[PDB]
Design a protein around this ligand. Structure first.
Ligand SMILES: [Cl-]
Ligand SMILES: [Cl-]
Ligand SMILES: [Cl-]
Ligand SMILES: [Cl-]
Ligand SMILES: [Cl-]
Ligand SMILES: [Cl-]
Ligand SMILES: [Cl-]
Ligand SMILES: [Cl-]
Ligand SMILES: [Cl-]
Ligand SMILES: [Cl-]
Ligand SMILES: [Mg+2]
Ligand SMILES: [Mg+2]
Ligand SMILES: [Mg+2]
Ligand SMILES: [Zn+2]
Ligand SMILES: [Zn+2]
Ligand SMILES: [Zn+2]
Lengths: 108, 124, 121, 108
């Protein structure tokens, strides 16, 4: 699975910049972040949630200096409701991933 | 053009408003935009953020830490749309060093306060 | 069953915030109705904290059963076990999905402080 | 490979109940938890840290009812030293994994 639902709340696993072919997406951190968001969109919908019901997002990043660029993409998908809480953490990510995002969302 | 913000003098450090040191790590209390005379600093969210950073610097130094040793910052904010402005000030104190973790939360803050920040830092 | 404590009268700035469907409490401390800190061991303080939590949850249209996260602040991590004995009396059949404990500088005479996140029904 | 070191802090990846041969340990959540701690010990050691310099632990489990049993074991390795921050949270773990722990420790 791609997460767990407990007590009306979906706790996703981390979504990475993976395309449906199994390759890491081509391009810069923005391109990767867009793919992370396509992957989140699908797991959120599957769970009965959406970008508008995310209460917390956690951004795992290879380099904290790249956060401004991730955040530009983040704001396009969370353009109706910015999550009330977010965290950003430097982490060791899978090979060629520059960004990974997990979310906590209310299930309607 | 080079841009500087004039550094604010810090609030007086109270005995329960500083923080605690455990196992070489300093865990600050949340610092709010109070000036040396105990009132909220004048001005917008950026001015309030500058005051918070001044107050942080004071408590970090008292604890034997500094901005360079901050490994986590949590920003408590009245309104998430004001994050961009807070982060503009954040980047002036955490310029050459960015803490490895940071979090932002919408929160209920004391009257007139638009921002509060707490830090975790390594005691050298 | 422990004697219920009388909740403090909590001011507008100490009763937290609702953002969309979620209530985010401020940290509740062992304050009594008379404005003084509980005089008693950490378990009595924790019971006080829980009655203050009960009051702020109910005013927000939430309850202990809708708490999805709790964070306990304590001066000494050695005291966690006793706080947790009390925690389990209020969070008995329902256990919040996330739970943290942190060492912190607390207000004068407070041995424990608790914040919660809860769904507004 | 596993985790990362930033500014004197080691941030481990989540350690699961796998033996050195890659097999999921036999037995209850307590036995699994002991294996997670052997695994944690190895990665802390590699990073130049120890249980004594762990400043935060996060425990992942499938159901929060499992916590008291995990914590009995946690208290054996974190006895005279108790990490200053401790979180527990529900998550989707790997097939057959009942428990997963990640730590943050000071690198002396
Ligand atoms: Cl873009
Ligand atoms: Cl400065
Ligand atoms: Cl850092
Ligand atoms: Cl400025
Ligand atoms: Cl953290
Ligand atoms: Cl829950
Ligand atoms: Cl009791
Ligand atoms: Cl060890
Ligand atoms: Cl510690
Ligand atoms: Cl055992
Ligand atoms: Mg939209
Ligand atoms: Mg908090
Ligand atoms: Mg984590
Ligand atoms: Zn694209
Ligand atoms: Zn100023
Ligand atoms: Zn009592």
């Amino acid at each position: 699975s791609q997460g767990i639902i407990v007590n009306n709340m979906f706790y996703s696993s981390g979504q990475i910049p993976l395309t449906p072919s199994g390759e890491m997406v081509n391009g810069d951190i923005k391109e990767q972040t867009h793919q992370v968001f396509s992957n989140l969109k699908a797991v959120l919908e599957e769970a009965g949630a959406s970008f508008e019901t995310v209460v917390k997002a956690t951004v795992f990043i290879a380099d904290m200096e790249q956060f401004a660029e991730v955040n530009e993409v983040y704001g396009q998908y969370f353009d109706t409701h910015k999550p009330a809480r977010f965290c950003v953490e430097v982490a060791r990510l899978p090979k060629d991933a520059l960004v990974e995002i997990e979310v906590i969302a209310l299930v309607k």
